[PDB]
């Protein structure tokens, strides 16, 4: 039964199976993403994945992010829940768990590029189009794409996110 764990790319058979499963969920739910691209970010050293584990073995969703610790902000790379598990509240519970985790990690802002429907989805999750975080903080660290809408979520130090 349901667990939200931080999946570490430590070269072990167990975690590496879970990362591959999460990666396959990502490419399935994000057809516009080059699959080799999802692989590169998910298994790079800089990235982490918080997954939704059904029991102690099956991946049904997760979020791949990258923390920029000194600057105290993190970028969401990919977010998804497997087809047969969508519309059950998991995606929202994941985001809440993520924010709570980032709060404990001393992260002040969450950033994510969004497109089309995703903008509305992240708005429901607390992200906004206007930023209260200074440009120069992410500039040079996070790529500046003109084709995408950059959204941010302020993580207040003592607001109860997650539950």
């Amino acid at each position: 039964l349901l667990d939200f764990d931080i999946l570490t790319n430590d070269g072990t058979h167990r975690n590496m199976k879970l990362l591959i499963d999460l990666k396959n969920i990502f490419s399935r739910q994000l057809p516009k993403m080059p699959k080799e691209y999802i692989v590169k970010l998910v298994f790079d050293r800089h990235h982490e994945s918080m997954v939704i584990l059904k029991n102690k073995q099956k991946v049904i969703g997760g979020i791949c992010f990258r923390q920029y610790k000194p600057q105290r902000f993190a970028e969401v790379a990919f977010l998804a829940v497997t087809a047969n598990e969508q519309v059950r509240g998991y995606g929202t519970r994941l985001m809440n768990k993520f924010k709570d985790h980032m709060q404990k990690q001393n992260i002040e802002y969450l950033l994510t590029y969004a497109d089309n429907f995703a903008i509305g989805y992240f708005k429901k999750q607390g992200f906004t189009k206007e930023h209260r975080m200074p440009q120069e903080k992410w500039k040079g660290y996070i790529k500046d794409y003109d084709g995408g809408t950059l959204m941010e979520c302020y993580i207040h130090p003592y607001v109860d996110y997650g539950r």
Binding site: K32, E75, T112, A114, Y121
Partner: peptide
């Protein structure tokens, strides 16, 4: 970057 930012793609989740 050899491949690297940490990024998405959802373009209209209604497909």
């Amino acid at each position: 970057a050899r491949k690297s930012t940490g990024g998405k793609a959802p373009r209209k989740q209604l497909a």
